[PDB]
Each structure stands twice: as structure tokens, then as C-alpha cells.
Amino acid sequence: SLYRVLILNDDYTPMEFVVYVLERFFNKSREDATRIMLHVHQNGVGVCGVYTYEVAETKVAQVIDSARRHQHPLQCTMEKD
Helix, strand or coil: CCCEEEEEECCCCCHHHHHHHHHCCCCCCCCHHHHHHHHHHHEEEEEEEEEEHHHHHHHHHHHHHHHHCCCCCCEEEEEEE
């Protein structure tokens, strides 16, 4: 059973940081990171990647840790895929 990692839109986190997160933690190409960031901006939520449960939890935690240490409120969660 695999799990999708999601990021949520907000009106505080810079677009460029979201792209950075997608490239750093989810192995996204520049183009794919840009498109996912924009999809989240437009739709409120988007999929970052799909992993086993414990790896998805790891990615969520790494994103939250990174975001808060960069002074951004970016929300990240996971759901069964």
C-alpha cells in the first residue's frame, strides 16, 4: 500500500521555496517542480510523490522541518495513494 505526499497552498510561502522543496526532497526536474508548484497555487493542493508509508512520513517530516527553518508555514501531509 503506497502513500502520496501532498503539499497545500498558502498565501505566505514563496513560490521559489516550493520549487526548491520539490527539487530537493521529491527528485523533481525543474520543469516538473515548477508545474506542480503552479498546480498547487491554482488548485489548493498537489501531489509531490508516492512512497511506502514510512518513507512518505519521512518526506512529510523533512518538508515541514525545512519549511519552518526557512520561516515558512508550508503544510505537507500524506494520503493513501
